[PDB]
């Protein structure tokens, strides 16, 4: 059954909450952003409004075949009236279309869900330093000190030199990255473009990333394997039996493959410098993990809610074992004490 933290009290919506069936007393259905496990549940049978971006809008209709007349996108920054209620929606800085929503009670009452986030000070120059928020729904992934990650310009910085020094050596060196979501673009973009490269991938990929708005993106993406040196693959097919198989596939094009895991956070971040990493490697494949983050750290989020001031927060990652309830509880009480409110 569906449960209280995708609802919003004193309305009729619910937020990230398609696999629970009809929702007893819910007249509108909010969508945050197009990963799997928000999403799970929708397809062309879908008879109710769904609210969220143009770009999730794009992907709905396109991808999971949700009919048109069902799907209602919304600007960003801008304030619009559902059944009733003023919404806003607000970049999360996390994959492509992805959003916060502000909801502004009848009765007074502001609420701000993040949906998936990444923290950043930016936000704190968008519609919320304009009014109180009482409560927050926290994406709360990474809310324990030990994740620390680097930027993610600085993580682009490493993965164009690393790739760029290795096909400057070795022109014949094929680079891969691993995919299997939305979200991480930067990633296969920067390494194509300091290559000269388009990134080369399969059709049902080209597709997904067509129904996101990128500029320039015609320039920078193919479905000609041949004509590209930086492919796209599954992520389950990054490891040195799956990456002996495709430089097979390539027919002596290449005798070299440098490829690169997006992970959210590995444990040697708690040692290692973004400098120090280094690579796996069997025979002529590397591959390097690198700790590429749509999610914010520990700090980032501390930053965001010590700046917010929330009355009260209530927690949506994380909420399944009470050991993790009572350590996040812990640190919005420390938040609290240490802030002031
Ligand atoms: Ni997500």
Same mark, same amino acid.
């Given at each position: 059954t569906c449960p209280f933290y995708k609802k919003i009290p004193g309305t009729g919506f619910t937020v990230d909450a398609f696999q629970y069936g009809v929702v007893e007393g819910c007249t509108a259905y909010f969508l945050t952003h197009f990963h799997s496990d928000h999403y799970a549940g929708l397809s062309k049978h879908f008879t109710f409004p769904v609210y969220c971006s143009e770009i999730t809008g794009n992907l709905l209709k396109n $991808?999971?075949?949700?009919?048109?007349?069902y799907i209602h996108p919304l600007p960003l920054d801008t304030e619009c009236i559902v059944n009733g209620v003023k919404v806003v929606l607000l970049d999360a800085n996390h994959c492509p279309g992805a959003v916060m929503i502000l909801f502004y009670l009848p009765n007074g009452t502001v609420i701000l869900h993040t949906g998936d986030f990444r923290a950043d000070?930016?936000?704190?120059?968008?519609?919320?330093?304009?009014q109180k928020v009482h409560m927050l729904y926290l994406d709360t992934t990474y809310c324990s000190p030990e994740y620390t990650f680097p930027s993610q310009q600085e993580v682009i910085r490493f993965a164009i030199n690393t790739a760029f020094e290795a096909v400057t050596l070795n022109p014949h060196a094929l680079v891969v990255c691993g995919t299997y979501?939305? !979200? $991480?673009?930067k990633v296969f973009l920067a390494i194509a473009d300091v290559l000269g490269s388009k990134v080369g991938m399969s059709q049902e990929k080209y597709k997904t990333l067509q129904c996101l708005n990128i500029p320039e993106i015609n320039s920078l993406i193919t479905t000609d394997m041949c004509s590209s040196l930086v492919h796209l693959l599954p992520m389950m097919q990054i490891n040195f039996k799956g990456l002996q198989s495709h430089l097979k596939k390539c027919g002596g094009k290449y005798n070299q493959i440098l490829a690169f895991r997006p992970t959210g956070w590995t444990h040697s971040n708690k040692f290692t410098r973004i400098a120090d990493v280094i690579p796996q490697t069997k025979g002529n494949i590397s591959i390097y993990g690198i700790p590429y983050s749509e999610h914010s750290s520990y700090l980032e989020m501390k930053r965001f809610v010590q700046w917010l001031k929330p009355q009260k927060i209530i927690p949506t990652?994380?909420? !399944?074992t009470w050991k993790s309830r009572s350590t996040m509880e812990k640190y919005f009480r420390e938040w609290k004490l240490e802030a002031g409110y």
């Open positions: $991808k999971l075949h949700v009919q048109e007349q000070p930016s936000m704190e120059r968008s519609l919320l330093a304009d979501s939305i !979200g $991480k673009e990652v994380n909420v !399944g």
